[PDB]
Scaffold this active site. Structure first.
Site, PDB file in Angstrom:
ATOM      1  N   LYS A   1      70.164  34.002  64.113  1.00 54.70           N
ATOM      2  CA  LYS A   1      69.983  35.408  64.465  1.00 54.70           C
ATOM      3  C   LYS A   1      71.309  36.123  64.191  1.00 54.70           C
ATOM      4  O   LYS A   1      72.349  35.673  64.678  1.00 54.70           O
ATOM      5  CB  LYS A   1      69.505  35.470  65.920  1.00 54.70           C
ATOM      6  CG  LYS A   1      69.129  36.810  66.523  1.00 54.70           C
ATOM      7  CD  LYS A   1      68.555  36.793  67.940  1.00 54.70           C
ATOM      8  CE  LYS A   1      67.140  36.266  68.113  1.00 54.70           C
ATOM      9  NZ  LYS A   1      66.563  36.371  69.468  1.00 54.70           N
TER      10      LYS A   1
ATOM     11  N   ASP B   1      59.132  38.618  78.281  1.00 58.14           N
ATOM     12  CA  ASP B   1      58.527  38.898  76.985  1.00 58.14           C
ATOM     13  C   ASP B   1      57.905  37.616  76.425  1.00 58.14           C
ATOM     14  O   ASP B   1      58.166  37.209  75.294  1.00 58.14           O
ATOM     15  CB  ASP B   1      59.463  39.585  76.006  1.00 58.14           C
ATOM     16  CG  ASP B   1      58.733  40.073  74.768  1.00 58.14           C
ATOM     17  OD1 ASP B   1      57.544  40.516  74.909  1.00 58.14           O
ATOM     18  OD2 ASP B   1      59.351  40.029  73.681  1.00 58.14           O
TER      19      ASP B   1
ATOM     20  N   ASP C   1      55.918  29.581  65.056  1.00 59.98           N
ATOM     21  CA  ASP C   1      55.627  30.153  66.366  1.00 59.98           C
ATOM     22  C   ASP C   1      54.146  29.952  66.711  1.00 59.98           C
ATOM     23  O   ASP C   1      53.310  29.816  65.806  1.00 59.98           O
ATOM     24  CB  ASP C   1      56.047  31.610  66.426  1.00 59.98           C
ATOM     25  CG  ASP C   1      55.217  32.523  65.541  1.00 59.98           C
ATOM     26  OD1 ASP C   1      54.029  32.737  65.857  1.00 59.98           O
ATOM     27  OD2 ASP C   1      55.740  32.977  64.514  1.00 59.98           O
TER      28      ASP C   1
ATOM     29  N   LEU D   1      62.984  25.543  64.770  1.00 59.42           N
ATOM     30  CA  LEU D   1      61.637  25.055  65.053  1.00 59.42           C
ATOM     31  C   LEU D   1      60.650  25.574  64.009  1.00 59.42           C
ATOM     32  O   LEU D   1      60.824  26.665  63.482  1.00 59.42           O
ATOM     33  CB  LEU D   1      61.217  25.364  66.482  1.00 59.42           C
ATOM     34  CG  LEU D   1      61.834  24.435  67.532  1.00 59.42           C
ATOM     35  CD1 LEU D   1      62.969  25.119  68.271  1.00 59.42           C
ATOM     36  CD2 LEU D   1      60.815  23.951  68.508  1.00 59.42           C
TER      37      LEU D   1
ATOM     38  N   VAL E   1      68.063  40.214  62.580  1.00 59.06           N
ATOM     39  CA  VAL E   1      67.239  39.555  61.541  1.00 59.06           C
ATOM     40  C   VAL E   1      67.518  38.056  61.701  1.00 59.06           C
ATOM     41  O   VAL E   1      68.681  37.695  61.898  1.00 59.06           O
ATOM     42  CB  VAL E   1      67.553  40.026  60.113  1.00 59.06           C
ATOM     43  CG1 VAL E   1      66.509  39.536  59.120  1.00 59.06           C
ATOM     44  CG2 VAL E   1      67.707  41.537  60.041  1.00 59.06           C
TER      45      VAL E   1
ATOM     46  N   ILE F   1      63.095  34.626  58.353  1.00 57.33           N
ATOM     47  CA  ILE F   1      61.929  34.246  59.146  1.00 57.33           C
ATOM     48  C   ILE F   1      61.559  35.287  60.210  1.00 57.33           C
ATOM     49  O   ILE F   1      60.835  34.963  61.140  1.00 57.33           O
ATOM     50  CB  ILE F   1      62.036  32.814  59.705  1.00 57.33           C
ATOM     51  CG1 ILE F   1      63.120  32.652  60.716  1.00 57.33           C
ATOM     52  CG2 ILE F   1      62.212  31.815  58.566  1.00 57.33           C
ATOM     53  CD1 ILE F   1      63.614  31.226  60.868  1.00 57.33           C
TER      54      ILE F   1
ATOM     55  N   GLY G   1      63.077  40.150  65.851  1.00 54.02           N
ATOM     56  CA  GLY G   1      62.469  40.091  67.196  1.00 54.02           C
ATOM     57  C   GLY G   1      62.880  41.246  68.072  1.00 54.02           C
ATOM     58  O   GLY G   1      62.687  42.398  67.639  1.00 54.02           O
TER      59      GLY G   1
END
Lengths: 285, 262
Positions: free
Chosen positions: A34, A128, A87, A84, A18, A11, A14
């Site tokens: 992550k 961020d 985004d 979740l 990954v 998914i 960031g």
């Protein structure tokens, strides 16, 4: 070790790592992992990971994404987040033609402000905040995520890293190279994000630093006393923006005040008239 | 302005005083450590001071490292030959946490005079994270201090530099500073500096903030007065060497008051 996690799909990536979507084979719990590669002959565990893990353990709030577990191996490190659905960015793009109901915008903003007020109450800058770092579920909640550019601050704040916030979301004090910056910078971002939920286009989409600032200088207005605003001495200018009720427009320009000392606090914003009627709708997925 | 986070300075102070209790090392962990001693820890912490000075690291970084060390040694038996490797690992961790531009891992291996390899420094890093369970955002003396500094009227570089100096002197000596909270130590050091440089005393403004009275702060204030007085004769001298420099206004050269008139 990760024998109970079964991978479903990727998914994205960031600040670092990954991120994949996964299912706990024993509880059926859907999660996001992550995966952070360690440099075990070179730099060891990345500073970004040390900050996100530590800070996200302090931070237990329903509008901040939940770190669940951290699985160490000798060569890998896996962060187990709550999953979740998607985004804010993706939702905004799916919502490009239909629009986002103004009730939901309030809801999302309110939750984001509770979330960020919780951060600031606990010595943390997110640094961020951008629609791609905000996660929504199917039941009307939104949560701050990607704490890789986060940072525990002291009082008063010191010179922190200059290379922070994606350009569009970057507050002017950072653009102009101010020796100090503070909680102001995160609000600015939510202010940019407020606007983007309404219109579904980013408010200050600069190609360059120069262009980024000119789009703000414009919204500010024409000169009064301090003639060129491109000065580290933040001059006193609040912008004007003449489908957002009078209250909405105020909140916005308080969140986008050019002087950081006069920019609204998250705490303050939470009490703004805008949120008197605020409810919690579910989204259209 | 917002650099002083007006709306959040109290909330933050509440939290840091709760976290300071949670991040607290075990008083007299050294008695349970078969092979290392308080004196040994003093050599280490002093060495960390020098290291921070060489690489021009923040003072915050130094205090974090020491917290990292005492918590680790609170739960992990360590042979003396490995004492420096714990501390290197911690300085590195603190640097990564705190600095904008931390030194490289190679530079942490250079300062150990190649007592340890790069892979030992890195393996200790992962071990330290495991033992501390990534809880690195530990409140420090310097962190309380900087807030206390806000209540000055007016500000005094000397008091600042001198409050910093005294806080740091505490790091060296597990006895008797493992038994005071960072907040308490910082209160004590702030009074003691203010007094020396101005003749002024723990402000009421800060009595209302901290809930600390010169009465509450006396066990500490006495241990630190003694520490300040016997400082030129301590085996460890890097802190004083540091605060002789003009960046700190040579507050290590000022003379401790003799009596605190309590």
């Amino acid at each position: 070790s990760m024998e109970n996690f079964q991978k479903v799909e990727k998914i994205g990536e960031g600040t670092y790592g990954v991120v994949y979507k996964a299912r706990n084979k024993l509880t059926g719990e859907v999660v996001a992992l992550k995966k952070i590669r360690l440099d075990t002959e070179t730099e060891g565990v990345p500073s970004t990971a040390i900050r996100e893990i530590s800070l996200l353990k302090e931070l237990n709030h329903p509008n901040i994404v939940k770190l669940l577990d951290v699985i160490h191996t000798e060569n890998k490190l896996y962060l187990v987040f709550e999953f979740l659905h998607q985004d804010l960015k993706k939702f905004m793009d799916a919502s490009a033609l239909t629009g986002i109901p103004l009730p939901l915008i309030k809801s999302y903003l309110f939750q984001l402000l509770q979330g960020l007020a919780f951060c600031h109450s606990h010595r943390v800058l997110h640094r961020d905040l951008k629609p791609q770092n905000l996660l929504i579920n199917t039941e009307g909640a939104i949560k701050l995520a990607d704490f890789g550019l986060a940072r525990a601050f002291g009082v008063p704040v010191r010179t922190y890293t200059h290379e922070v916030v994606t350009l569009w979301y970057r507050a002017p004090e950072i653009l102009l190279g101010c020796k100090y910056y503070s909680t102001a910078v995160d609000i600015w971002s939510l202010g940019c994000i407020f606007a983007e939920m309404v219109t579904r286009r980013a408010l200050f989409p600069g190609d360059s630093e120069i262009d980024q600032l000119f789009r703000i200088f414009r919204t500010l207005g024409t000169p009064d006393e301090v003639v060129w605003p491109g000065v580290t001495s933040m001059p006193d200018y609040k912008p004007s923006f003449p489908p957002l009720d009078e209250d909405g427009r105020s909140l916005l320009s308080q969140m986008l005040h050019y002087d950081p000392n006069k920019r609204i606090s998250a705490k303050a914003a939470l009490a703004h008239p805008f949120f008197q009627d605020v409810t919690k709708p579910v989204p259209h997925l | 302005g917002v650099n002083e986070v007006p709306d959040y300075h109290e909330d933050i102070h509440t939290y840091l005083r709760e976290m300071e209790v949670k991040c607290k090392p075990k008083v007299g962990y050294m008695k349970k450590q078969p092979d290392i001693t308080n004196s040994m820890r003093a050599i280490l912490v002093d060495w960390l001071v020098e290291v921070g000075e060489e690489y021009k690291l923040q003072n915050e970084t130094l205090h974090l490292a020491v917290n990292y060390i005492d918590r680790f040694l609170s739960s992990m038996s360590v042979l003396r030959g490995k004492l420096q490797l714990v501390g290197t690992a911690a300085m590195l961790l603190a640097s990564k946490f705190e600095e904008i531009y931390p030194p490289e891992v190679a530079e942490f291996v250079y300062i150990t005079d190649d007592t340890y390899t790069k892979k030992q420094v890195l393996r200790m890093e992962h071990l330290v994270l495991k033992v501390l369970a990534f809880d690195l955002a530990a409140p420090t003396i310097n962190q309380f201090l900087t807030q206390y500094f806000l209540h000055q009227q007016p500000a005094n570089c000397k008091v600042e530099s001198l409050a910093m100096f005294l806080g740091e002197l505490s790091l060296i000596d597990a006895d008797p500073y493992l038994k005071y909270l960072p907040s308490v130590i910082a209160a004590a050091a702030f009074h003691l500096a203010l007094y020396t440089v101005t003749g002024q005393s723990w402000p009421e403004s800060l009595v209302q903030k901290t809930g600390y009275t010169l009465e509450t702060l006396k066990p500490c204030l006495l241990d630190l007065h003694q520490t300040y007085l016997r400082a030129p004769q301590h085996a460890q001298q890097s802190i004083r060497e540091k605060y002789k420099n003009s960046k700190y206004h040579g507050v290590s050269l000022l003379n401790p008051p003799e009596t605190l008139n309590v």
